[model samples]
Target chain A: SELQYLGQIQHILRCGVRKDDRTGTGTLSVFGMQARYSLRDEFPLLTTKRVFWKGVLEELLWFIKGSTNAKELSSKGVKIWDANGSRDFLDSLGFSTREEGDLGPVYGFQWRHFGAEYRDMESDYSGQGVDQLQRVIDTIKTNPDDRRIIMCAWNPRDLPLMALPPCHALCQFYVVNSELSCQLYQRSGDMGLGVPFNIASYALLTYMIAHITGLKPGDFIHTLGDAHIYLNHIEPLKIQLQREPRPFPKLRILRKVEKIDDFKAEDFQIEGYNPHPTIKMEMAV
Target chain B: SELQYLGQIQHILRCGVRKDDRTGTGTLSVFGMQARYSLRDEFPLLTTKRVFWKGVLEELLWFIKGSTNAKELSSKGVKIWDANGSRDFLDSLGFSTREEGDLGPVYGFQWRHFGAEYRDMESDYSGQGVDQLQRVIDTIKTNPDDRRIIMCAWNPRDLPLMALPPCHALCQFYVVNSELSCQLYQRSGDMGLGVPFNIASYALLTYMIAHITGLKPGDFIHTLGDAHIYLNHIEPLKIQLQREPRPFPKLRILRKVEKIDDFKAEDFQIEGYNPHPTIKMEMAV
Candidate 1:
């Protein structure tokens, strides 16, 4: 059920400490929190309010292609990353000389080519760096018991070069009893706008990897370092908290996907999603 | 209290899945577990059985000094790392060319110089790379509200050249209401033996950092990716589990230390620590 997700919100609104953030907006924050969402038989897309499933799918696919250009995603009508890739934000981070839409070595670049030198968004990175995503899939199939199956995006060397450091920094995958589970250590979380999307993103990632490796999807454990709710989102989250959660919807992969990179957006369907109306909340990025 | 630690052991014993691991010694393992121990005015030295506080202190001091040489710690009568630093283990890991006791770019190197190229442990690395520990202390003093206050030991590029991938891979520090809290994301944990030592180690670290940064110690949150109990030690753990946990001890810093590098082994005292006899469990190398 989505009660755990809702319960965390309720807990934060009641008990979180008031703190200032980099975005200049204040937040009600708690440190060191964890929540588990099951990927067994059903997906964990939020049923309390509508989550944009298409955005989640398209963004992941774009990441799989290792495109650091935000325009690549924007061309597909997904503007979730547009603000972060804007020239104003890039200039604010002192990436003034870099071209627009070039978020230097962000999540996608780190996922596919961890140690590669970032030249530019247009440079050919074919067969470059350590492909951690491929290594994870290979390790699962060859030796599931290995405790070191990890994919990390928080490179200290590359931190200064990027438009933004990864909020969801590192994730480790575990396989037991022919089931694959993932645990993500998000250094910080936005409880209002980003958490729900992050939850669905990782759960979908777990499911996709499980489907490819001949394993079942287990739990997606989200561990947060500084879990915060923005000050303005308090009232809307309170309204969301008052609404009872509906049952989680199940995700259906329409094709028999054998490889991780072969799946398309149309090959999936989200079934039985009934939720309360959306309570719009702005992102603090 | 220690009940949280004990309760996790109980839960793992009762319902943990039997799984094979890196070491040939099998384990009853559960993935994604968290336990919180308070460091406010008291230290979390385990009371059910005697924990070697000296080893914990010395090992941490060794790490703080950025010494990857096991012999340096061995000279202090700490041989915990001697096994991993032996010639046979080095040879087994294909580090035959390296000298004995020189663990290639392990936690110490990564903590101090993350992106610096590893030539050898004996080579001079003074002011060579990113000093993340100093940066963490600085961030605490300058910007306590920063969410990216983290110290990481896992390097994807350096993983192949090491004796072992870091088990306690990354840690994040948080400050709220003038209290500093740390959350450690350990990739794998030995619940019966290593977990207790890791808890006290991190808690003590939080206290030291808080002392230098002029703040009160809050909580040490231990988050694990794979929390396990090796099969051979299960009996000893069950025996240790029956004993009741006594009160935690308070740590006292004897002198005012303004710098992070100024603390010595004799500058601390642990009073009122009464506990049961030691129940030894052999670590699986």
Candidate 2:
């Protein structure tokens, strides 16, 4: 139920310790927590508040397409990564050749070509790195029960060169009884602003992968390392908790997309998304 | 309490799905689970059945020393790694130039020098990879509240070269109110044989790191991805579960060893470790 998602927010508020963060905005944080969502019963989009469905889908498609430049995302009218695209932040990290929107070797690059020799944002990486996405799809097709179906994005060599190290560092997919299940190990989660989007993004990824691999959707198991709520987000999150949760919106793929990269923004439709108005909170980043 | 550790085994037996693994030893596997042990309350050495404490300590020290060879561990009277040392397994993975007992770039290699280039088991890893242990200790001493006090061993570049990929892939340390707590994200666990050792190993690790950092020990959160029990160990595991759990033994670190690698195996002792006899179970390669 949607209350499982709300329960995590309440749990953090009740039990989390006061801790300082990299963003200088403090958080009430817990060390380790697990949240499970059954995607077969319902899509895990929160009904307590309005989630930016379009932005989340666009981000997933961007990752599948293996694009690191934010322009590819921005052209699709997604502004979620605009702050990371600012020249000031990129330059502060000492990235010289990056333009306004280039996120260097972030999630998408790691997903498509993990452990590949990363040259730069502009260089050709056609035959570089382990193609984890293609490997995962091929394994699911050939050996669905293999225990090593892991897709990891935490490359230590490239962490310093990226705009941001991946928060959702790695994920493992499982296939049982002809259904696909995914588990995410997120190193740090910003509970208010970022978690909602991350939850939707990965759940959508699970659904898409299941569709392509010809398996039914199972569970999206989210494991967090530093699960936190920003100090400023406490008030808005409490208000969100007060709102009654609605039924989850149904996701409809408009066309039979064969490949993971073939997913377009127009190829998907979200239906029956009735929810409370969006509550605003400053992102810790 | 030891019941927390036992409860995980019970959970897997009752509800875990039958799944095939890479080693061909089938498992009753569950996807996501978390077990917590409070070090302040008691040492988390299992008391329902005997766990080899010396082997666990030696393995931890080996990782701290950054040695990839099993010769150091074998010299300390730990034969737990003997099966992995067989030439057949090493050559099957195409690791040429490996001797009979060398575990190439396993846990210790990745721990102290992650992302270091590895030519062979005998090559010097000086001035290569990230020294995560040293960095973590320095961060705790300087800024104990930093959220990124992470020690990770899942190097994507080195995964293919290692004898075995890290099961306990990554861990994050959290300091709160002058107390140290640790969380481990293990990608896989053998519920019958490996998990008991894994729990005590990391709990001992948390105790050791906390001692050096001038903080009281807090919780050791053990999060698992594919927690499973081997089919052959069901009878023994079921018999072991029928016995009531005893009190946890206390871990006594006698000397004030300043350096992480300074503590010898003799400097540690387990107090009040009265448990059932050791149950032997073969490990899945």
Candidate 3:
């Protein structure tokens, strides 16, 4: 019933994002609809089904913090699964693998490490503790002259060690009209479960940049190469539909915070976040 | 100083996730830790940089929810960039340039279409919106099918509309000793900015799947084809390095609700988030 929206979308917006020749199976879900809000009011969490908002937030912080270990996650009480036998980050996060490199920190480590072998790097970019996301943003705002403001997280050498590599691993940032803009191209997405968080997190980062740099947060264009949902999560999608839609919440970051490492999760607070019960579903890993 | 960690990582965990060249340009980073947390604690966010946690969340959700248009992001106050002035969901999402025959859903849409398309068909296990992720997870838990339980997001036919075709688009699930395992193969990654998020998201998804199916999360195998960093975002990397790291919080998914479409923004919540300062940077769109 609700899928009628897709047809409407197809009618209005047509840019062959997807086309299926196997018409007997199912229709593809193309786009989403929602409203905008300032981080000043409330955080963006849907009232429909209960999502792991806490997990989402902490993960975002971890990425911004450029952490590459699972010890931090263990300390916080979010250990839902066991780590791999090797104690690698992916294993620490409780990835299941028939072998090593079946699962792990595909994002953080990639963002920070261009690999010890990467060439043509800047002197300052060298080292193990680099913050790749921040580096891209800074280059866009401060150093427009530097043409190589790139942040990569893909390591071909480690493909054996990792069961999978990065998805939205490479993103480029540009500065236009004194505003910082980011275009993220995700290789894969669990359409039912993953897309929302990506949208919110990047958008929030865009706004935060706007606030800190005194420039308007421009566009946060996303490019998903392969975005799909597990069949199991479908049941959970139904419960979310029963819930009523609410006004977009405003997310207000503490004005005092500026530098990347300066602010903590506690520094950020949501003013209004009222919604129905959280909908839960088993993610097909 | 801190980069020494990467030096160590470079020697180990070599799976093509990163380049094998050790020229020592050092633009990339390495890590020696992993986040260990209980799902009840908080989500992971890197405090070292101004990680747009909210935007990340929205983006993730958007992808899973299979939204191609910018309206959802625009309404959410997460508009840091737009897709080439095209309101068409596919165009806005920047998959394929607006070609006439290319108007359709991307990978996620293929995974979860709202209805049936006249062209839907399956050939050699290739079909749109097949929910391959579920097939693998089920194979691991139920051991019902002898099939490999593979999901392919990359379709050679649909590459025309996409600005960039699926990189890291195929995934395979495994069951060893009744433990659920996942191996994700990516074609490319920008190690600096995109890898961290990509790794974490998939790892988390794998963990969630293992839990529901009564299987333990074993390993998150990440495979990479081509991983690199863009030529910008150098300065911000330095800033992230300067920031200190705090303990990671846990990520809890409020369980019980079912149905993919039923989810709303309020369904998710974060707890125990104590991060460092924010890393501010710009994006090169």
Q: What is the C-alpha RMSD of each candidate to the true structure, in Å?
A: 1.1, 1.7, 23.8
- Model 1 RMSD in angstroms: 1.1
lDDT of 1 by residue, B1-285 (tens): 899999999999999999998788999999998888889889999999999899999999999888899988999988988998999989988888989999888888988888898998788798887889999999999999999999999888899998888999999999998999999999999998889999999998999999999999999999999999999999999998899889998899999999878999999899899988999898897
Q: Model 3 residue A246 lDDT? A: 61
- Candidate 1 DockQ vs. native: 0.85
- Order of candidate numbers by TM-score, starting with the best: 1, 2, 3
Candidate No. with top TM-score: 1
Q: Can you tell me the CAPRI class of model 2?
A: medium
Best by DockQ: 1
Q: CA lDDT of B31 in candidate 2?
A: 89
For each candidate, the DockQ is 0.85, 0.63, 0.02
Over B5-68, each residue of candidate 3 has an lDDT whose tens digit, in order, gives 2222233234222222222342332111121222222334444443455665565566566554
Cα deviation at B237, candidate 1, in Å, is 1.1
Compose the digit string of candidate 2's lDDT tens values, residues B167-225: 99888888888888888888888888888899899888888888898888999999888
Clashing pairs for model 2 are: A116-A129
Ranking by DockQ: 1, 2, 3
Give the candidates in order of lDDT, highest first.
1, 2, 3
CAPRI rating of model 1 = high
Candidate 3's C-alpha runs over 4 A off are A1-44, A80-105, A117-126, A129-131, A143-150, A177-179, B1-285
Which candidate, 2 or 3, would have the higher DockQ against the true structure?
2
Candidates' TM-scores? 0.98, 0.96, 0.41
